[PDB]
Each structure stands twice: as C-alpha cells, then as structure tokens.
Design a protein around this ligand. Structure first.
Ligand SMILES: Cc1cc2nc3c(=O)[nH]c(=O)nc-3n(C[C@H](O)[C@H](O)[C@H](O)COP(=O)(O)OP(=O)(O)OC[C@H]3O[C@@H](n4cnc5c(N)ncnc54)[C@H](O)[C@@H]3O)c2cc1C
Ligand SMILES: Cc1cc2nc3c(=O)[nH]c(=O)nc-3n(C[C@H](O)[C@H](O)[C@H](O)COP(=O)(O)OP(=O)(O)OC[C@H]3O[C@@H](n4cnc5c(N)ncnc54)[C@H](O)[C@@H]3O)c2cc1C
Ligand SMILES: NC(=O)c1ccc[n+]([C@@H]2O[C@H](COP(=O)([O-])OP(=O)(O)OC[C@H]3O[C@@H](n4cnc5c(N)ncnc54)[C@H](OP(=O)(O)O)[C@@H]3O)[C@@H](O)[C@H]2O)c1
Ligand SMILES: NC(=O)c1ccc[n+]([C@@H]2O[C@H](COP(=O)([O-])OP(=O)(O)OC[C@H]3O[C@@H](n4cnc5c(N)ncnc54)[C@H](OP(=O)(O)O)[C@@H]3O)[C@@H](O)[C@H]2O)c1
Lengths: 528, 528
C-alpha cells in the first residue's frame, strides 16, 4: 500500500489522487515549498527544477488540458497565462485533498531496490530534508520528476563559440525582455521556446534572428473560425483518417493543412522534411513579426567569431549582443541506477513510457515522460490511473517480451512518423486508447451510437476532450456527459464580451473535409 | 507660377515635386525643422502637428505605398517601422531635390484672397518665422497640413466623465507602454490606434478593455498565403466585381471575406452593420490577445463613476487606472476663412476633395484630405499632379455646378457605402481613375490587352500598385513596366532568408474566386 511519489508537479498530483482512488497510501516528496512544478513562475532558475519565462501562455486549450473530472472555470480564457494554470492546479490539489500527502522541502536523493526485491518488490527511498538524510521502505515508487529541467545545451557543437565575447545562455534562463531593449539577439532553435522568446524580443530589440536546422510547421492558437486549434485538430475521426489512409494521401493532407495559412517557403520556415509529424510550433505572432521585418529565420550557424555569427548559407549577423540557446531539454533521474530505465542499448526502454520491463515486480512507474498534441494533464491522469491499479494488483502487465515486442514496434513507428526512434512523441488518441483498454475506460463508441448517439457523435467527431476518458468504466465522473456536451459553451463564453452576432458554435451537421472527397468520388465512379 | 505649399509632410513633398514638373515655382512653409510630418516620431506631441506612438508600423504594403516612380529598396520589409518610412521619405526629397524649396521653422499664420482676387486670383500668405511676421503674394496655394492632428475628443459626450479620478488622455499622447505595467486600462474606440494601443498594453498591463460603439471588421497584414493584404485585396478586377454586382451579392461577398479567418461574433468584434465598407482594422495580434484573455471587447460606455466605467450591457470595469480615447481626429485650417472650404451647409465641400468650387479662379488646392484602402503617398502624388496642371493652365476645372453636382452625387454614394456623407472614405481605384482621366494618365487597359498583354494582365488582375499610375500618359516613368512585372520579386525577397522551399509567387492562371460561381452556374443553367 505504501507508494513514494517523487515531485508535486502536475504528474505527482495526478499520481497522489490515483493512489487515493485505489486505496494506496501515497507519500509525495517535493524538493521545493510548492506544488505545480514548472507552472509556478519564479524570477530565478533553481537547479533540478524547470524554469519558465514570464509571458508563457498554455499552447493547449482549456477544454483540452483539464483533469477529466475537473473542468476549468467557465470564464477562464481558452489559452491561459502560466499564473492562471497555477491557480487551477492549486484549486485541484485543494479540491482532492492532496496537500496532506506532500512533504515539502524534501529532496529524494536515491531510490534503491530492497535487498529482497525479487520476493517483496519494495524500495528504499532516501530523502535529504534539512541537510538531514533519512530512509524508508515503500512498496512502489512513482517518478514524477519531469523532463523539461536539464537543458540540452550543445556548447561543444558550434565552432568558434568559445571565442564569442557577448553574453550567451539557454532558454531556461530567459525571463523578461527588459534588458534587451535595442540589443542584437540571435536565437538558436525554432522550438516553441525559441519562437516565443524571438517574437517577444522582436518588440524592443534592435534586430532578432532565429537560426533553424530543419525548420518547422507553424500553427496558431487561433485556428479555423477562431476556434482553438486542438479542439479541431485532435479528433477521433481525424485520427481515424490519418491512421487508415494510404500514407502518401495522409502525408499530402497533413502538409496541405500546415501550409494553408501562409506559405512557409516564403517565410523561411519550410521544414526540411514536411511529412514528419514532429510537434509543430504554436505561435500566433511569428508570421506578422517576420513580414514586418522584426524577425528573420536563417539556417544553422556554421561558425562564431568574437562578435559575429556566420550561417551555413554564407550570410552574417554582425555585432551580436546575446545568443539564446532555445535548444530544448534532456532527462536524467540522478537518484536511480541507470540500468533501470536505460535497461538496453544504453537507451531509455519503458513499456508505454511508464513501466521498465525486466523489473522482477511491477512496482516502479514513470509518469509524464510522454509528449503528444494532447496535453500533459489529461495524459498523466490516465497514466497514473493505470500505474495505481497495477500497484493495487487490480491490473497486471503483459509478459516481459510481450512488452519488449511492443517497445520495438513503437520505436519503429516513431522513426517512421517523427524521424527518431528515441523521441517522446506519440499519437495522442492512440496512446490514450491503449491505456484506456488496460483499465476498461476506453469509451465504447459503438455502444454509444446505440445508446445516446448525440454523445457518441460529439465523442467521435468532436474534440477529444479529457472528459471522454472518465465517461465510462471504473473511476468515471457523472459530470462527464454534461461536460462534453457543454464544452463549446465554455470555449465561446469568455471571448464574446460584446454580443452582436449570434454566437457561432461548430456543427457536426457539417463534414468540412468530405465535400471535395466523397461527392467528387461519387460523380467520378458514377459515370465510368 | 509662384505656389505656396503649407507643410513638408508627404502631401507637401508630393506638391513640391509636381509643381517642379509643371514649371511652377514652389515655396514650402514647414512649421518644424524637418520633413515627413507625421512619420517622424517624437517623444512629445507638438501643437499643430500629428503625433504617432513609437511602435507604429505601416498598415499598407511597400509595393502599394511608394511614389509611383520611386520603389522602396529591394530589402525593405513589406510593412515598415515608422522610422524606416521616414528614411524613404528623406531619400525621396534628397533624390528629387525638394529641400531647396522648403523654409523650415516658418508657421503659416494666415492665407487671404488678394483684394483684386477676381482678376488676379492671387493670395496673401502670412508667415511667422522667429516670432517675426511677414507677408507675400502667391499665384496659387496648396494646403498640405494634414488631418490627423486635431484630436476628436468627445469629453462632454460620456455621462460622469468629469468625476473620474484616474488619468485620462487621447491616442495622440500615447507613446510607450512602460508606465502602464500592471495597470488597468480602458481604451475607447476600436480603430487602428485603439487596437494597436490595446494589444501593445495587453503585454504588461493588468487588464485591458476596448469599448466599441459599432465594432469593426479586422484584417491582418498577413493575408491569403502570407501575402500582404493590400496586394491581393486592391485589384482592378476585384473593384470591377464589387462595383458591378447586385449590391446584395457584393455585400454578402464582402462580409464572407472579412469573417473568414475568425468569427467576429465570438470575439465581440462583429460590426453593428457589416455591409458598411468602413476602413477595417489592420491588426495581427488582436484575435490571439482576445483568445488568450489579455484583451476583451465591450459595448459603449454608459456612465463613468469616480473609479469605474459601466457599459451599455450593464457590466462594469472596476478600479480603472487610465482611460485612452482612441477616438480619431477632425481637421481645421486655422489660417483660412471657414467660408472657403466649408462653403455650404457649414460642411466641407471640395471637388474631388481638392478644389473648393465657387472659388472665382482655381488657385487653391487641398492635398491629402482623402482616405481609402489605398495609401496616401500614391494618392497625393496623383492629386498634386492634377492641381499642378490646373495651376499651370494645362488642365481646367468643369463648371461650378458641374462640380457641385459631382459633390452631391459623391455625398450620396458615401452615405450608401459608408453610412456617412461627410466621411473622407472613398473607393481607391475609382478615385485614382477619375483623376487619371483629368490628366490623361489613366492606364488604357484595352490598349494594353492588345499591345503587351502580359503587363495588361498584371495591371488588371494583379495589385493596383502605384507604378501603374505613371505607366502611360504625361509624367510617366520608363521604370514602370519593369517595376510592375517585378513587384512580387521585391515582396518575397526580404522575407525568404532561409531557402528551403521553392519561392511561391501567386498565379494569374488561378481564379481563386471563380470556381464556386462559373462552374456551379455551368451545371445548374446547364440542365434547366
Ligand atoms: C515553456 C513550457 C510551456 C509548456 N506549455 C504546455 C502547455 O500549454 N500544455 C501542456 O500540456 N504542456 C505544456 N508544457 C509541458 C509541461 O512539461 C507539462 O504541461 C507539465 O507541467 C510537466 O509536469 P511534470 O509534473 O511532469 O513536471 P514538472 O512540473 O517539471 O514537475 C517536477 C516536480 O518534481 C520536483 N522534483 C524534481 N526532482 C525531484 C527530486 N529528486 N526529489 C523531489 N522532488 C523533485 C520539482 O520541484 C517539481 O515540483 C510546457 C513546458 C514548457 C517548458
Ligand atoms: C498612426 C498612423 C499610421 C498611419 N499609417 C499609414 C499607412 O500605413 N499608410 C498610409 O498611406 N497612410 C497612413 N496614415 C495616414 C497618414 O496621414 C499619411 O500616410 C501621411 O502621413 C499624411 O501626410 P500629410 O502631409 O497629409 O500630413 P502630415 O504628415 O500631418 O504633415 C503635415 C505637415 O504640415 C505641417 N504644418 C501643419 N500646419 C502648418 C502651418 N500652418 N504652417 C507650416 N506647416 C504646417 C506639419 O508640421 C507637418 O510637417 C497613418 C496615420 C496615422 C495617424
Ligand atoms: N505553452 C507554450 O507556449 C510553450 C512555450 C515554450 C515551450 N513549450 C513546450 O515545452 C517543450 C519544449 O520546447 P523548447 O523550444 O524548449 O524545446 P524543443 O521543442 O525541443 O525545441 C528545440 C529546438 O531547438 C532545436 N535544436 C535542438 N538541438 C539543437 C542543436 N544542437 N543545434 C541547433 N538546433 C537545435 C530543435 O530543432 P530540431 O527539431 O531540428 O531538433 C528545435 O527547433 C515543447 O513541447 C513546447 O511545446 C510550450
Ligand atoms: N499604420 C497603422 O498601423 C495605423 C495605426 C493607427 C492609425 N492608423 C491610421 O490613422 C487613422 C486613424 O485611426 P484611429 O484609430 O486614430 O481613429 P479612427 O480610425 O477615426 O477610429 C476612431 C474609433 O473611435 C470611435 N469613436 C469616435 N468617436 C467616438 C465616441 N464619441 N464614442 C465612442 N467611440 C468613438 C470610432 O467609432 P465608429 O467606428 O463607430 O465611428 C472608431 O472605432 C486611420 O486612417 C488609421 O488607419 C494607422
């Protein structure tokens, strides 16, 4: 029953609550004095903790990034300031009575198999508190220590950088644009950090450049008809199509969508390989900032000088005041023997990104080491539900090489779809469904068409909103049906503060992507 | 031959150069020590002068807002910082040798018909210089004193405003957002000033609201396929359609376009009367700022309190720190008898916005008192060409009531199209064509379709770029043809700083707006 939970960020909180709903006895160790982890802004980056800049807004929609049984307030904006999310996370801990189970100011310094591990499956958790080390035995462990904390910072990768006389640092340490007024800034990396920092700087800096290896597709929070992108883009029907179409048709369809608003070619953003379903950039400002000549995109940096950067196409950025490395993150687990997670090819091998296979007893779970178009909060809520049930012997894992087979197959899919077997990227609805099956909470679409087809349609054709994953099966929420059916109400409410039109909600009586298909395939193969 | 020119802004400079090309002897009086007028930023609003805030970017494209014979440098951004335009204006004055003819630091204090005006048609121009009045006789006068200087500020229009204890001022005096950090700001007016100031503030203010009577359509610099809006939207063909379609079809087509990117209804921007071809808002940030909950739109203010504003729908904005009136401008001419310009119904009456009819001899011209989707620079270049020719007795006006008839007809059209007979708004290509005819510089589309049909097509179906207005007829430029044919090169060059795609210039072999009409009118009325 005793479960150690490392971290009180979103992953940890999800874990505590899932432990409680399976009658386990959770203890959550948090090295700082607050919950929310990454989402609580602070002026200075702390070691071992993620570090966000002040102007971060969610890039997932509110109706897509709530705990499935706890919607965001009706009046909340669809995309929220970091502080607004912190407020919600805090609300959720309070509501679900999770604070009891958290020991703050306690670092977990090591986690070690018990000497009798093959028969008990217990763990020795060591925790440094006031400078005072301690130790205790737990039946299971949940690692919720995050993967946006240890910067990926290839210093040793750029010829000449040693010589550069200006200030130079990583996305992690960017906070406010104040001190950059009329400065010359180069940003390395066309990620969401890179683009946010570049566009923000572009309002006050003298000149700003983003250097990109591979380019990137760029989407926006404001999508078709001003609806949040993810409520339109992440759909069981849309996933059905991209899953079960000739991959040349599907690859075509994807690139059409991504390149519809503006021609990436003309803006210097066109990805080297546009078929890759890599996580896109979500950034509303960037095209305008580029067209107004406040940001330009260049290829990778070839060489630095004392004062300059020269790019792979020959051009030069003179008199650079500052270089920002917006080059992403790795991940670590300093408190754990490398052999547990990296149990093969010196490479992270986890069943469904969660359970290390080879483990004699399934009593360690990694929560939140998974990236999709979908949001962390709903993803981790599901991960935790499953891990909690595995710990309570209510579910059991498949066999050891059943799991390794799955891992091998997934690494192959990952290379195909993302160009990396080692990425954390996965297809959201697919992943959510796999885990859904394991705990019997995958919504039965057909059973719905047959009883309550209104809901069935909104579930399949509409947003793959978190509510759906606590609709039926154990741990379901009674609010779920109502929540799904009122999701567009909550989306349209806050934005319509001057009522002149009639509010326009999306129609299912629509098929916007089936008029130039099944009708034109109905006058073509109705003639020949 | 002696012509007095009041002001050395864009209108004045256009006037000086047109005077020179008709052999007149221009004298330009400029109250300040520099040219460019409104476009040269300064920290503090000067009396009698326009006043711009620091972050103003052009909302017209470079290939649409150059003097027709002087394109912007190849590398210039399609939309430019105010300082960049100042640089171009300065380049133009230098190149065309206009500085000789400007007396700086000289205010024009009055302009008076000579006592022998009915025979000579001359003018007494009085100018204060060093506190030192002088006076001189001129054959003609060109008024180029602008119409974005005297703020429209309805103080006694808002019940309770006298009592409001917070700071309160007009768009004119907004400059930097620094001092508004975490302040609560209400902005009155959903014009381009209002929206710029609101969105800028929304990055650092605590809360920002825009109050709008009537709402507004909102376009963006980044239009279809990332091309500048005006290069796509302002087209002879497009004007042909909206001119000669049943006005209910055309009104439908206009609203479809404006409401395509996002549903104004849902964002609180929907205009009270969406058929009105009022100048739209050009603003790239606003939808995202609204969707992120940093800006919300409310109806008109009903009542102010000591500390609050209450809106027509009952809601309230508590603890307002600052109210910004972004409520536009009127216009004046303090140096001129009211009877000259307002020569009827105590209402501005000018033939083609330029010549006061009733004037015994046509020796006074107002330059730049005209607004369209088109840009001031090309518009005033044409106005000045005509006025200069009228002054040199190379052209002559129609009869006095021929002109009044035209004014009456125009005021009717204005009420129909804009809901105001008194607006400065007019249809760009129509106006440019009328003036074109008068000086024999209206491009002969048919003659082109017959000789050089490549050019003919780009002139008619492509952007109504300034080049086209000095293509044929007197005062033409030989660079014009080449300029028109390379306009997309100059648009795409600066923005494509990382070459991965193939650059995508637009096709005429396209008709993007002819596939759901001439085909559906080809299976429907191809059956019945
Ligand atoms: C700039 C940025 C924006 C993002 N925006 C979005 C978005 O809009 N939508 C979205 O879904 N996701 C977003 N993400 C992804 C984000 O990572 C997740 O939403 C989520 O916050 C990660 O939560 P976590 O609990 O797994 O990690 P963290 O928040 O990093 O949680 C780790 C916690 O454990 C503690 N801890 C670490 N090590 C130890 C130890 N050894 N002992 C004890 N305690 C420890 C830390 O103090 C922290 O409290 C964003 C990430 C970044 C960087
Ligand atoms: C914020 C803003 C953005 C704009 N953006 C655009 C745009 O992108 N594109 C566009 O086409 N238009 C734009 N406009 C419209 C703009 O008005 C024109 O581009 C143009 O600047 C107008 O020039 P002007 O010569 O008529 O008047 P002004 O620029 O006001 O110049 C008038 C000159 O007359 C002088 N003057 C006035 N009275 C006297 C006197 N008695 N004696 C001597 N001198 C006098 C003043 O010192 C000044 O130098 C914008 C306007 C604003 C406010
Ligand atoms: N909510 C928000 O608005 C928001 C804001 C910021 C971040 N986030 C989230 O946090 C996560 C991390 O984003 P991030 O920008 O910090 O990291 P990221 O998504 O991993 O981006 C890293 C960027 O730098 C490039 N890069 C990596 N190593 C490089 C090297 N050695 N040389 C040159 N370029 C290199 C990568 O390009 P390749 O693809 O070519 O490697 C990529 O463009 C994302 O999921 C993001 O969505 C969210
Ligand atoms: N290049 C740029 O980016 C840029 C930036 C700013 C301005 N400009 C240009 O400068 C010009 C002026 O723009 P602007 O915003 O200053 O002024 P404006 O275009 O005249 O707009 C004024 C706004 O305030 C409203 N208003 C006027 N009187 C009011 C009252 N008594 N109560 C409530 N509302 C009232 C108007 O309402 P109605 O709509 O109901 O009349 C309108 O929404 C335009 O040509 C504009 O394009 C350009």
């Amino acid at each position: 029953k005793k479960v150690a939970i490392i971290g009180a960020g979103v992953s940890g909180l999800a874990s505590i609550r899932s432990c409680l709903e399976e009658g386990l006895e959770p203890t959550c160790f948090e090295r700082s004095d607050d919950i929310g982890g990454l989402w609580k802004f602070s002026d200075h980056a702390e070691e071992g903790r993620a570090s966000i800049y002040q102007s971060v807004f969610t890039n997932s929609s509110k109706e897509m990034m709530c705990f499935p049984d706890f919607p965001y307030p009706d009046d909340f904006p669809n995309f929220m300031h970091n502080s607004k999310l912190q407020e919600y996370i805090t609300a959720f801990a309070k509501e679900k009575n999770l604070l009891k189970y958290i020991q703050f100011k306690t670092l977990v310094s090591s986690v070690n198999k018990r000497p009798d591990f093959s028969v008990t499956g217990q763990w020795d958790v060591t925790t440094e508190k006031d400078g005072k080390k301690e130790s205790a035995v737990f039946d299971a462990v949940m690692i919720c220590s995050g993967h946006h904390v240890y910067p990926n910072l290839p210093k040793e990768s750029f010829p000449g950088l040693k010589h550069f006389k200006g200030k130079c640092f990583h996305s992690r340490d960017y906070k406010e644009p104040g001190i950059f007024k009329g400065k010359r800034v180069l940003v390395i990396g066309l990620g969401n950090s890179g683009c946010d920092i570049a566009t923000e700087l572009s309002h006050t800096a003298e000149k700003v450049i983003i250097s990109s290896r591979s380019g990137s597709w760029v989407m926006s929070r404001v999508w078709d008809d001003g609806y949040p992108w993810d409520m339109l883009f992440i759909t069981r029907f849309e996933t059905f199509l991209k899953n079960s179409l000739p991959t040349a048709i599907s690859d075509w369809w994807y690139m059409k969508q991504m390149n519809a608003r503006f021609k990436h070619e003309n803006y210097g953003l066109m990805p080297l390989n546009g078929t890759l379903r890599k996580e896109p950039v979500f950034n509303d400002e960037l095209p305008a900032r580029i067209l107004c000549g406040t940001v330009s995109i260049k290829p990778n940096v070839k060489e630095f000088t004392e004062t300059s950067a020269i790019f792979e196409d020959g051009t030069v950025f003179e008199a650079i005041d500052c270089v920002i490395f917006a080059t992403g993150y790795g991940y670590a687990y300093p408190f754990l023997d490398d052999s547990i997670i990296k149990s093969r090819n010196n490479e992270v091998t986890l069943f469904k990104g969660i359970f290390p296979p080879l483990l004699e007893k399934p009593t360690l779970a990694v929560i939140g080491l998974v990236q999709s178009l979908g949001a962390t909060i709903p993803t981790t809520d599901l991960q935790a539900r499953w891990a909690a049930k595995v710990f309570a012997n209510s579910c059991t894992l498949p066999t050891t090489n059943e799991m390794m087979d799955d891992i091998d197959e997934k690494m192959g899919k990952k290379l195909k779809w993302f160009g990396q077997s080692q990425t954390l990227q996965t297809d959201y609805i697919t992943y959510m469904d796999e885990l859904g099956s394991f705990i019997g909470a995958k919504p039965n679409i057909p059973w719905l068409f047959l009883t309550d087809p209104q809901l069935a349609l909104e579930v399949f054709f509409g947003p793959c909103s978190p509510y759906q994953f606590r609709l039926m099966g154990p741990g379901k929420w009674d609010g779920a049906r109502n929540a799904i059916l009122t999701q567009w109400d909550r989306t349209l409410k806050p934005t319509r503060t001057r009522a002149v039109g009639e509010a326009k909600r999306p129609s299912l009586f629509y098929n916007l992507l089936k008029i130039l298909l099944f009708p034109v395939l109905l006058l073509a193969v109705l003639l020949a």
